[PDB]
Design a protein around this ligand. Structure first.
Ligand SMILES: [Mg+2]
Ligand SMILES: [Mg+2]
Lengths: 228, 7, 228, 7
């Protein structure tokens, strides 16, 4: 629905929607910007990620509320409404995955952009895996794993251990291991090794980069504290 | 329960 | 879109959506319940009010963010996006006012239901007045005033001064006076007289009714502190 | 700035 708006106006409006906490608008504006067919800048990739993370985050929180009510109960209303929210969430994940496939990932040549999009791909398959129960559930889990793994391989070859996207990717892959793949030891090992190798690289950073990296290291430590 | 990346 | 769902299922789903903080869903479920054509119970009126108050409340907060950005600025994007949010807000207010007119108010015979719906009518014209700038703005303000005034006349004749809907109506009519009608002295006098007459009636109440009434009296006092 | 009714 955004084809008649200028790319720069879509970007401007996405920033306004973020300030207004109108994340569904924000996501639609950024979807329109992606569909212009040009690659996304660092800041623009951030806007895309923030928009859809907020949208799906609200759907995931609602799905978890309804799922717990449904479990406590087990007429059809709780199941029906959980299924409605679940279908809406799957639609948003499919939309994001479609933007990544057409054609963000194939046009992403630099390590920073390619790792960013593969992390997104892993995240949205992870969100699909959280609600999955059928024939394709193992394939959904393996799609998340495969996206995260490729992003990790690139990030380890091409980025310093303190790079925020490398740190965030390792954080989320470790959550995938703990929550989705039932591999808590892998989750813990990944979080520890990521934290320790980042610690040893902080000395190379400016004060502003140091602030960015240690913020994400604290999330790794929070999980390690929760898990051990 | 665990933290994934967030701003 | 809700015509094929049972009334009781719409009500059940509205309660689930509230728990899931899915207020747009909640409002759509309650709209469907109203359109069944039966009068609403006390609890059901509450659900309708909570749903739409949350929806428009988010739109009002976004409109205020964008309006302030627009004022600070005075290309077309901030104005265009403010106008988009403003049109969406006006649509929600028109939907609520349409439910009240067709046919909640005319079928509301008891004082409790009739005051409730007239308070809603005043509130949603007030929200229209907050964004209004054209030929109809004075008429919008007078529509809010007229709805609030009829509700006040009934509430004073038919309800004790501590009744929560009477208190909430007086609170919101006083906000209308202060913010919309540029009558701060009327706002202050209404808030004071409402507070004092409720204070003098607390002795008649149970502990649970006392808790309800004093909660709203504290909002009246908060405004009096802000205004004097 | 002033408070209207809210839960
Ligand atoms: Mg390229
Ligand atoms: Mg009747």
């Amino acid at each position: 629905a955004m084809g008649s708006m200028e790319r720069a106006s879509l970007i401007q409006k996405a920033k306004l929607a973020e300030q207004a906490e109108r994340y569904e608008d924000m996501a639609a504006f950024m979807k329109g910007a992606v569909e212009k067919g040009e690659e996304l800048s660092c800041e623009e990739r951030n806007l895309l990620s923030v928009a859809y993370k907020n949208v799906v985050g609200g759907q995931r929180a609602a799905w978890r509320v309804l799922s717990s009510i449904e479990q406590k109960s087990n007429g059809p209303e709780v199941r029906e409404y959980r299924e409605k929210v679940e279908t809406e969430l799957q639609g948003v994940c499919d939309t994001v995955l479609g933007l990544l496939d057409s054609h963000l990932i194939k046009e992403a040549g630099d390590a920073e952009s390619r790792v960013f999009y593969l992390k997104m791909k892993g995240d949205y398959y992870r969100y699909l895996a959280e609600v999955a129960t059928g024939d394709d559930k193992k394939r959904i889990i393996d799609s998340a794993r495969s996206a995260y793994q490729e992003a990790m391989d690139i990030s380890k070859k091409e980025m310093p251990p303190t790079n925020p996207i490398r740190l965030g990717l390792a954080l989320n892959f470790s959550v995938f291991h703990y929550e989705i793949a039932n591999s808590p030891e892998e989750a813990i090992s990944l979080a520890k090794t990521t934290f320790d190798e980042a610690m040893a690289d902080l000395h190379t950073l400016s004060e502003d980069s140091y602030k960015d990296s240690t913020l994400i290291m604290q999330l790794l430590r929070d999980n390690l504290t929760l898990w051990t | 329960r665990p933290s994934s990346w967030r701003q």
